[PDB]
Amino acid sequence: MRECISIHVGQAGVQIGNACWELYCLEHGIQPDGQMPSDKTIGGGDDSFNTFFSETGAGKHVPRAVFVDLEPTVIDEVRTGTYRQLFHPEQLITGKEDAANNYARGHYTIGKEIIDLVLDRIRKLADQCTGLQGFLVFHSFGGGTGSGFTSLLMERLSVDYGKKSKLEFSIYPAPQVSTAVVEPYNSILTTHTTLEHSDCAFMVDNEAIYDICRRNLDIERPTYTNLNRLISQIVSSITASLRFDGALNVDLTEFQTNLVPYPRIHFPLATYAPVISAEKAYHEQLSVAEITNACFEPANQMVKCDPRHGKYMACCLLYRGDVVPKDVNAAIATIKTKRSIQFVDWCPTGFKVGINYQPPTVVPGGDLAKVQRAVCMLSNTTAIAEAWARLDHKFDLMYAKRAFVHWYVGEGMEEGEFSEAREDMAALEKDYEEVGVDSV
Amino acid sequence: MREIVHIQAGQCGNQIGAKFWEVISDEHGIDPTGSYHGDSDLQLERINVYYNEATGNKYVPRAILVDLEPGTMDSVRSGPFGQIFRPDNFVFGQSGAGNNWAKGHYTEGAELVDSVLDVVRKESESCDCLQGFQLTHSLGGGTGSGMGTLLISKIREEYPDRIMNTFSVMPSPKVSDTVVEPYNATLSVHQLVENTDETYCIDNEALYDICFRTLKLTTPTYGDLNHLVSATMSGVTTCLRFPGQLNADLRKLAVNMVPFPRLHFFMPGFAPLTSRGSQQYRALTVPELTQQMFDSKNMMAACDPRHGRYLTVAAIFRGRMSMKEVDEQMLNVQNKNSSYFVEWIPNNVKTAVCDIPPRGLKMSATFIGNSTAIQELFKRISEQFTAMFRRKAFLHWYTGEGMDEMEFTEAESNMNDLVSEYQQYQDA
Numbered sequence A: 001m002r003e004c005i006s007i008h009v010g011q012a013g014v015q016i017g018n019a020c021w022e023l024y025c026l027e028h029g030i031q032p033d034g035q036m037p038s039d040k041t042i043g044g045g046d047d048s049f050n051t052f053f054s055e056t057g058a059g060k061h062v063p064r065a066v067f068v069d070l071e072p073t074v075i076d077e078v079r080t081g082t083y084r085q086l087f088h089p090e091q092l093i094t095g096k097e098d099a100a101n102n103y104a105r106g107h108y109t110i111g112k113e114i115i116d117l118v119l120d121r122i123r124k125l126a127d128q129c130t131g132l133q134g135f136l137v138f139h140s141f142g143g144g145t146g147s148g149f150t151s152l153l154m155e156r157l158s159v160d161y162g163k164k165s166k167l168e169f170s171i172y173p174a175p176q177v178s179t180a181v182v183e184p185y186n187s188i189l190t191t192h193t194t195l196e197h198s199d200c201a202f203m204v205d206n207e208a209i210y211d212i213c214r215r216n217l218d219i220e221r222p223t224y225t226n227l228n229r230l231i232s233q234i235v236s237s238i239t240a241s242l243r244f245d246g247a248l249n250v251d252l253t254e255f256q257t258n259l260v261p262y263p264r265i266h267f268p269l270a271t272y273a274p275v276i277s278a279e280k281a282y283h284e285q286l287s288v289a290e291i292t293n294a295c296f297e298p299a300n301q302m303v304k305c306d307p308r309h310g311k312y313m314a315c316c317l318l319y320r321g322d323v324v325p326k327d328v329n330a331a332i333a334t335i336k337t338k339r340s341i342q343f344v345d346w347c348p349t350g351f352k353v354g355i356n357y358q359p360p361t362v363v364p365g366g367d368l369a370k371v372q373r374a375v376c377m378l379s380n381t382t383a384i385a386e387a388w389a390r391l392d393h394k395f396d397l398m399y400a401k402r403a404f405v406h407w408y409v410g411e412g413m414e415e416g417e418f419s420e421a422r423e424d425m426a427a428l429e430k431d432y433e434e435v436g437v438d439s440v
Numbered sequence B: 001m002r003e004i005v006h007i008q009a010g011q012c013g014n015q016i017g018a019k020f021w022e023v024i025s026d027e028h029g030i031d032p033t034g035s036y037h038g039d040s041d042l043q044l045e046r047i048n049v050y051y052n053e054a055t056g057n058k059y060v061p062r063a064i065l066v067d068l069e070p071g072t073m074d075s076v077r078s079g080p081f082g083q084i085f086r087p088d089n090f091v092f093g094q095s096g097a098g099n100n101w102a103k104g105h106y107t108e109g110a111e112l113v114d115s116v117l118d119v120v121r122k123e124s125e126s127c128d129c130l131q132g133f134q135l136t137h138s139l140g141g142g143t144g145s146g147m148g149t150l151l152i153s154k155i156r157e158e159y160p161d162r163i164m165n166t167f168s169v170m171p172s173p174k175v176s177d178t179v180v181e182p183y184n185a186t187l188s189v190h191q192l193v194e195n196t197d198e199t200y201c202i203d204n205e206a207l208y209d210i211c212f213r214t215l216k217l218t219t220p221t222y223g224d225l226n227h228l229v230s231a232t233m234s235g236v237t238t239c240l241r242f243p244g245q246l247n248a249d250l251r252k253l254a255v256n257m258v259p260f261p262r263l264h265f266f267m268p269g270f271a272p273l274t275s276r277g278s279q280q281y282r283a284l285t286v287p288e289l290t291q292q293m294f295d296s297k298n299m300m301a302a303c304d305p306r307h308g309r310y311l312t313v314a315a316i317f318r319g320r321m322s323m324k325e326v327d328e329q330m331l332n333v334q335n336k337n338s339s340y341f342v343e344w345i346p347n348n349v350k351t352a353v354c355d356i357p358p359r360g361l362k363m364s365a366t367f368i369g370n371s372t373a374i375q376e377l378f379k380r381i382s383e384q385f386t387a388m389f390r391r392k393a394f395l396h397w398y399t400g401e402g403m404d405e406m407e408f409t410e411a412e413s414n415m416n417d418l419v420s421e422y423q424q425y426q427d428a
C-alpha cells in the first residue's frame, strides 16, 4: 500500500505509457527483464516503488498497469519491444477493429465487446493490492478509443470501485500532429461523459509540447517519440511523490486537497522546467530561482493559455533533485514581488511545496539534458478554461452544420447526446467564470 | 488523584508527544530502556503521575499512541526513546485521514476508536486514582483534529468525572500543509470548548515567529518548532511531576485557572528562549526571567497580551534561585502593570518554584496565562474559515464523508460566541 494501477487506453495512452514505464525503470534501477539488484526483499515488500510495481517470487518487478487498444498494432510493439518481459501477456489487451476515430465505436459498437475482459484484467491487478489508492488513466481526447473506450471504462470503474480515486492524463488535440478532423466531437463527448467520474485530470496540449520541443530542444519537426519523452518527464514529476520517499516529500493526494476547490474544477495546469538541450546545459547551471521563475513563463506550460489574464485558486511546486527549502522560499519571495500572480479572494495565497531528492533521469539517445534539479508547478487557474473555449468553438463550427454527425448516429448515438455534452461544456466554462468573480 | 493517562493522536500529536517523553524521561532520570539512572530523590517521588512501574524494575510511560496511518508511529518506534513505549499502546489504522476532520471524526476514525478506548480502559483499570487525561494533537489535520476530538467525546462519556487536558496545536498559513486547516480547526475548537477542562493553545504562528525573529533561524523546520513545544510542555507540567510547596494535579489547575467553564484556553510562555545546538552561556537574573516570561515575544500563542486582560496566571520558576527575589519580581511586575490583570479576582497570579532546572539551563521560567487576548487567535481562524466558507470552497471533501454545511455554520457560531464571551470580561 498504497498501490496505484495505471490504465493506458488507445494509441496515445499506450505510447505515453511506454515512455513512462521505461523512465520509471530507469529511475528505480529496474532492468528490461524486471530484475532490480538493489531490491533485497524478494517477491514482495512495501517500499515506495511498490505503489507502481508488484514483485514475483523470481524477483521480477512488474508494472501495476493495463494497456488497452481496440486494434492490435500499437500494443504489438510493446509485446515485441525492449520492455516485453516487464509485462505479463494478460496486461496487454487488444481487439481486432479500432474505433475508426469515432467516439460511438469506442464507447458502444466495438468497446462493449472487450469491456468485461478489461475489467476482469483490472480486477486481477486490484486483488493483488493490500490498500489500493486508485487509478491513473492515460488517453487522448481525440481518438475513437481514447475518447469512447475511456469514457465507458471510467463509468464502469465508478460502478465497480465506488469512489476510489481516478486521475487522468489527457492528450488535448493540436492541428500539427492530430489524426482526425472529428477530434473536437470526440473531445467534448468524452469530457462530458467522464466529468463526474474523474477526481483530477492533467491535460497535456499537444501544441504546447510540440512548441517546447521546437523552441527549447531545437527539434525541427517533433514526432510522437519526441513529445512522449517530454510528457513522461512531466508525468514522472507528478508521480515521484508516490514512488519515492523522503522527509520533504509531499503526497500527490495532499496537493489534490489544494487543487480541487469544487468537484468539477479539477483540471490543474502543469508547467515544467528546465527543458534544455545538452549543448545549452553544458557549463550552464540552472539554479532553484531560475527553474522556479521558468514556471511562470507561459511558454513552459503543458496547456496553452494565459494565467496572467486569469486568477489562481492554488499553486503547488513539486521539486526534484538538489533543492533545499531555504532556496525555494527565497525564489518564491522574489517571484511574488515581480509576477502577475493574482488569487481569487476566497483562497489563501501560500504556495504548497514538495521536494523529492532523487534527481531527474533521462532516457538514452534522448533530447533533454540531464540536470541537477527540476520542478513541476501545478496550478489551479481560471485560465485553463481558454482550452475549453477553443475546443468548444471548433465543435460549434462543425455541429451547427451537423458535419460528420451521421457517422455517430449510424453507430447508435443521438443528436441529443451532442447537445447535452456541449451544454455541460458551456456550464463548465461558466463555472470557471463564476469562481473568478469576487465575493460579495 | 495520582495517575495521568497520556494520549497522542496523528502526525503532529505523535511528534510533539515523542519529544515530551524524551524531555521528561531525561528530567526524571529514565533512559530509553526504562531504567532509572539519576541521583535525586525528587526525580522519583511523584513519578507515578506519568509512569507505570513494571516489576522490571522498569518505568513505562502511561502513553497511548494513535494514528490512522502507520508512518509517523513507525518513526516514533525507531526514534531516540522509541523502545520505552508499551508496544500494545500503539493503535494504528492504514488508510490515513487526508487532512480531513470528517474522515477522522466520522468515517475512518470511527472505525479505529473502539480499539483505542480498549487501550485507554486497560490503563485506567490499572490506576490507583486516575486524575484524567492529557491529549497532544494538532487542530489543522484530520487524525489529531477529527479523531482526537472524537476520542475526547468518547472518553468523557465513559469517564465524565475525570479531567480532560489538551495541548492543541493551532494552524497558521505561515506553516501550512493544506488550505482546509481553518475548517479542521473551527470544527475542532467547537469540540474543545464543550469537552475539555483546560487547553494549551500552541500556536504555529507564534512558534514560527519565535524561531525567525528571536532564534534567528531563517528557515524553521517542524523540529525547531517542536523544541519550543517540548520545553513549554515540560514547564507547564512541572508542578504535576515534582514535589514542591504547592502540590498540583489536573483538577486543582482547572479550579484555580478557569473562572467560567468555556474560558479554558491557556496562552503558555517560556523563558529563556533558546534553540537546539547554539545555546547561551550567560546566566539569567531573576528580573530578566520575569521580564522575558511576560513578554509577547515569549508567548506560544500569537496574541498581544496588551490587547486584553489576564483572568489568572500560573508561573513556574525552575533552578536554584532566591525564592524571595522571585516573589519580589512577580509582585513587582503585577504592581507595575495592574491594569492588565482583572481587579475582581484577588491574588490571580500564582507562583511556584522547583529546584530541578530543565536540561541545558541553570534557570527557567514557564508561563501559563488565561488571558482574554486569546480571542485574537480565534478571530484569526474565524476570518480564514469565513473567507473560504462564504463561497463553500473545498466543502466537497467533507460532504463526501456525509457531513452537512449546517455543521460548519454551527461550529463557526460557537467559536464566534467564545470570542465575544472573552470580549465581555476584557471590559469588566
Ligand SMILES: Nc1nc2c(ncn2[C@@H]2O[C@H](COP(=O)(O)OP(=O)(O)OP(=O)(O)O)[C@@H](O)[C@H]2O)c(=O)[nH]1
Residues within 6 Å of the ligand: A009, A010, A011, A012, A013, A015, A016, A069, A070, A098, A099, A100, A101, A102, A139, A140, A141, A142, A143, A144, A145, A146, A147, A171, A172, A173, A174, A177, A178, A179, A180, A183, A206, A224, A225, A227, A228, A231
Ligand atoms: N502526445 C501524443 N499524442 C498522440 C500520440 N498518439 C496519438 N496522439 C494524439 O491522439 C489523437 C488521436 O488519438 P489516438 O490515441 O491515436 O487514437 P486511438 O485512441 O487509438 O483511437 P482510434 O485509433 O480512433 O481507435 C491525436 O490528437 C494525436 O495527435 C502520442 O504517442 N503522443
Ligand SMILES: Nc1nc2c(ncn2[C@@H]2O[C@H](COP(=O)(O)OP(=O)(O)O)[C@@H](O)[C@H]2O)c(=O)[nH]1
Residues within 6 Å of the ligand: B009, B010, B011, B012, B013, B015, B016, B097, B098, B099, B100, B138, B139, B140, B141, B142, B143, B144, B145, B169, B170, B171, B172, B175, B176, B177, B181, B204, B207, B222, B223, B225, B226, B229
Ligand atoms: N508544531 C508542529 N506542528 C505540526 C507538526 N506536524 C504537523 N504540524 C501541523 O499540524 C497540522 C496538520 O496536522 P497533522 O498532525 O499533520 O495531521 P494528522 O496526522 O491528520 O493529525 C498543520 O497545521 C501542520 O502545520 C509538528 O511536528 N509540529
Ligand SMILES: COc1ccc(N(C)c2cc(=O)oc3ccccc23)cc1O
Residues within 6 Å of the ligand: A178, A179, A180, A181, A182
Ligand atoms: C481532412 O482531415 C483528414 C482527412 C483524412 C484523414 N485520413 C484518415 C486519411 C486516410 C487515408 O487513407 O489517406 C490519407 C492521406 C493523407 C492524409 C490523411 C489520410 C485524416 C484527416 O484528419
Ligand SMILES: [Ca+2]
Residues within 6 Å of the ligand: A039, A040, A041, A042, A043, A044, A045, A055
Ligand atoms: Ca522487494
Ligand SMILES: [Mg+2]
Residues within 6 Å of the ligand: A010, A011, A071, A098, A143, A145
Ligand atoms: Mg488507434
Ligand SMILES: [Mg+2]
Residues within 6 Å of the ligand: B011, B141, B177
Ligand atoms: Mg501531516
